[PDB]
Amino acid sequence: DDVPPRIARAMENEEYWDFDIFELEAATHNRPLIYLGLKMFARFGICEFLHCSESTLRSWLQIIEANYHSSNPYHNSTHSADVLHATAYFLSKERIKETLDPIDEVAALIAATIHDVDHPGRTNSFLCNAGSELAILYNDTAVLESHHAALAFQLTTGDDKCNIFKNMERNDYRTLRQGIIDMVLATEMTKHFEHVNKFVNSINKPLATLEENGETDKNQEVINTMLRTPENRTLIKRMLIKCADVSNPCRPLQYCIEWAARISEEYFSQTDEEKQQGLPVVMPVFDRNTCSIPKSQISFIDYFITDMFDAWDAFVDLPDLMQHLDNNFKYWKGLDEM
Numbered sequence: 469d470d471v472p473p474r475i476a477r478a479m480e481n482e483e484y485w486d487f488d489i490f491e492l493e494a495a496t497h498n499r500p501l502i503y504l505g506l507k508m509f510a511r512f513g514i515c516e517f518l519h520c521s522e523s524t525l526r527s528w529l530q531i532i533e534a535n536y537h538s539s540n541p542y543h544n545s546t547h548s549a550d551v552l553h554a555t556a557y558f559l560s561k562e563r564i565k566e567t568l569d570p571i572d573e574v575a576a577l578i579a580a581t582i583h584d585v586d587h588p589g590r591t592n593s594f595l596c597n598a599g600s601e602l603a604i605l606y607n608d609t610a611v612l613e614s615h616h617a618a619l620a621f622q623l624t625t626g627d628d629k630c631n632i633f634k635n636m637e638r639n640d641y642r643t644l645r646q647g648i649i650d651m652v653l654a655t656e657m658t659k660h661f662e663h664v665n666k667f668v669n670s671i672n673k674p675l676a677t678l679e680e681n682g683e684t685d686k687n688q689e690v691i692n693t694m695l696r697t698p699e700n701r702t703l704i705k706r707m708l709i710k711c712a713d714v715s716n717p718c719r720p721l722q723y724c725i726e727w728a729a730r731i732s733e734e735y736f737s738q739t740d741e742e743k744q745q746g747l748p749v750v751m752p753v754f755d756r757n758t759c760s761i762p763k764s765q766i767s768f769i770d771y772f773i774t775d776m777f778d779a780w781d782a783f784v785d786l787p788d789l790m791q792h793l794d795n796n797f798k799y800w801k802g803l804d805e806m
């Protein structure tokens with residue numbers, strides 16, 4: 469409502485995939501998550517669902533955004549706004565709209581918003597090796613992933629001005645809470661192929677068998693019955709949050725390159741401190757004095773992204789992302805020049 473001009477225009481084409489998140493970031497002065505959050509939450513009707521006022525939502529968006537680190541190149545409020553944008557975009561897709569229910573839409577949007585809150589610009593392994601208080605607290609197991617959700621619920625429920633969950637039913641909140649916790653914990657690296665295997669085997673292969681057999685009215689209910697089961701809806705939520713979290717290789721070229729530099733700069737900054745303090749180098753290839761970012765991005769896309777978005781694309785149909793993925797992959801190849 470009370471929105472300045474440049475920032476209002478910066479959120480013009482926000483249903484579209486080609487959306488300039490950095491123009492929002494620049495216009496908003498490192499506060500894009502509250503501005504993009506209010507519009508997305510209003511579009512998805514989330515406070516109507518949660519029974520909150522706008523004032524509670526504004527206070528909730530500011531306090532969690534405040535706890536994102538400006539110092540971090542990549543892991544800041546603009547990343548989680550970018551992930552919020554990707555999440556909302558996937559929810560808008562026809563497959564996801566008719567598969568998932570209204571409570572999942574709210575879980576995903578909240579989960580995305582908080583998914584890297586108070587990220588220290590460092591990996592879990594670093595925090596275990598460096599002897600961090602979170603590694604002791606979370607027992608070297610999902611250290612950041614547990615911390616993000618835990619802090620996010622510490623900040624939300626601990627103050628009445630921030631508590632967006634206060635006017636809900638107790639049983640509905642527990643269902644929504646478990647949905648958020650599951651999707652925030654689903655973002656960890658170590659369980660990548662665990663979650664991707666499940667998605668191809670549980671959803672795509674059975675769905676391919678159904679389309680292979682035919683496409684009758686009765687067969688359509690069996691496809692709906694299979695996917696809409698609570699077990700498979702969780703599997704889709706995990707694949708959605710994971711794809712949103714690493715959607716930057718599938719962006720318009722200018723955004724892809726910016727995102728690649730930011731995360732590259734983080735990993736170099738960690739590598740400097742690993743060398744400096746006298747720690748074991750968990751990420752040796754990501755050094756500022758030896759890493760080819762164009763080669764690393766090719767390897768990143770090959771090892772994780774391509775198979776993941778292949779499964780996710782088959783399900784949702786994301787031609788623009790795949791068309792952008794191929795274009796960026798060819799650009800990163802093109803920087804050989806000798």
Ligand SMILES: C[C@@H](c1cc(OCC(F)F)ccn1)n1cnc2c(N)nc(Cl)nc21
Nearest residue numbers: 657660713714716717727728731768772773
């Ligand atoms: C956050 C970080 C990341 C993502 C990972 O993804 C593997 C799986 F989740 F897809 C694994 C480890 N770290 N990450 C996000 N975007 C990234 C990108 N373009 N390149 C790299 Cl080298 N790491 C990225």
Ligand SMILES: [Mg+2]
Nearest residue numbers: 583584612655
């Ligand atoms: Mg994370």
Ligand SMILES: [Zn+2]
Nearest residue numbers: 583584655713
């Ligand atoms: Zn993340």
